[PDB]
Ligand binder design. Structure first.
Ligand SMILES: CCCCC[C@@H](O)[C@H](CCO)SC[C@H](NC(=O)CC[C@H](N)C(=O)O)C(=O)NCC(=O)O
Ligand SMILES: CCCCC[C@@H](O)[C@H](CCO)SC[C@H](NC(=O)CC[C@H](N)C(=O)O)C(=O)NCC(=O)O
Lengths: 219, 221
């Protein structure tokens, strides 16, 4: 076995799956979509449940839907808590955080005028809607993890999203010292630290070639 | 309180999936309708909404938000998420895909009146190309009344919701999908579901002008 990820060569929606696999210590392969014809081939052969990517071949199955993929991996590698109470919290936090990450996922495809507007919208949402929640959680119970004092899917997705946000707004954590310190400790967990170093399968911020490619593939 | 309390405007929107799963599970629930900006501010200002948004459901002493997380929770409390990880994983993917289709319906009332016509067409194409054929083949494949295992799951409830809501706009949408037709009849005759479909349930009607106007009045600065 060994997971194989099907996506174009870039972050998009697949980046959360890369984060969670790397964080769990799971090495993986990628089969990159570069052309519209490669997508059609993948759709032609019944490999994509709903004709879309992300898709991951894992444990003899061909999983689709970003959130389902994440839930499966988390459950295989103790990243979804120890009971229903913790699972529920992790789930809500992840779903919330994915609504913020969505703004970064769509950013590359907005007109330039709207791209600037969207960075402002990102800043407002992070600072007013999301970060205070996680900041308060971390200030209140003091721990290095949001839930159950062990690494969970909520920590991994929050880290991805924070780090992605900081690329657009370098000082975004300045009013959030507990989140600053959280980000640093999380970033030192051996698997995460390696994922963040050169040579991992972590994808860079999207360049003009990725944007043209996705337009070419998905129109 | 064991009686859930649902916070949302008086209408379907995103909350209707929650109403569907609760009714399907035989859970009586109460509703607290958001009718104005001021009521929303109160809910937000008081820290009752984790991320400042609805749907929010008070259940088993918790204030759950995020439609997907609310549905998962209810499904785990009422044996609608299968009996093992293989089933759970299938149910999860099916719900997630179905919700991408249901999204077209949720957002349809808020499009420009010229775009609405185009979006019914596009709604029809997505359903018939992308989703229905997957589910038709599953239901031909094991000849079982349910999508996963041999019992009602979250995936059946959300699929039924979605099929029925599509049929309101495209009445013949299932004509090339005989197994889906049969499945829709079976599910619609499960007593909890059959009661939900009857007048007097808390099932909400299609969105009207009162509803649309209200949501602009609540959620728009
Ligand atoms: C506007 C131009 C780009 C649009 C595409 C973007 O949405 C994303 C690329 C981001 O870099 S992803 C490609 C898309 N996938 C999904 O939307 C999965 C959603 C599901 N809810 C999930 O989370 O898995 C796709 O596969 N489309 C095949 C097709 O329809 O033929
Ligand atoms: C088009 C004009 C407004 C449309 C709003 C619609 O999206 C929905 C109403 C459908 O009739 S719902 C109202 C919205 N909720 C969410 O977006 C939750 C999403 C989360 N992913 C979920 O699934 O739970 C909201 O509460 N916004 C508070 C605010 O920001 O002030």
């Amino acid at each position: 076995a060994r997971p194989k990820l099907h996506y174009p060569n870039g972050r998009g929606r697949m980046e959360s799956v890369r984060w969670v696999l790397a964080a769990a210590g799971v090495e993986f392969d990628e089969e990159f979509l570069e052309t519209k014809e490669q997508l059609y081939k993948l759709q032609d052969g019944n490999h994509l449940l709903f004709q879309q990517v992300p898709m991951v071949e894992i444990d003899g199955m061909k999983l689709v839907q970003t959130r389902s993929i994440l839930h499966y991996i988390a459950d295989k590698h103790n990243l979804f808590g120890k009971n229903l109470k913790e699972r529920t919290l992790i789930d809500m936090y992840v779903e919330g955080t994915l609504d913020l990450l969505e703004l970064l996922i769509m950013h590359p495809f907005l007109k330039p005028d709207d791209q600037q507007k969207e960075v402002v919208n990102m800043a407002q949402k992070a600072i007013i809607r999301y970060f205070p929640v996680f900041e308060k959680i971390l200030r209140g119970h003091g721990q290095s993890f949001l839930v159950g004092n062990q690494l969970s899917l909520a920590d991994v997705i929050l880290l991805q999203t924070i780090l992605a946000l900081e690329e657009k707004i370098p000082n975004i954590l300045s009013a959030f010292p507990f989140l600053q310190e959280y980000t640093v400790k999380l970033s030192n967990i051996p698997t995460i630290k390696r994922f963040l170093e050169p040579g991992s399968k972590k994808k860079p911020p999207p360049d003009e070639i990725y944007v043209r490619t996705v337009y070419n593939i998905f129109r």
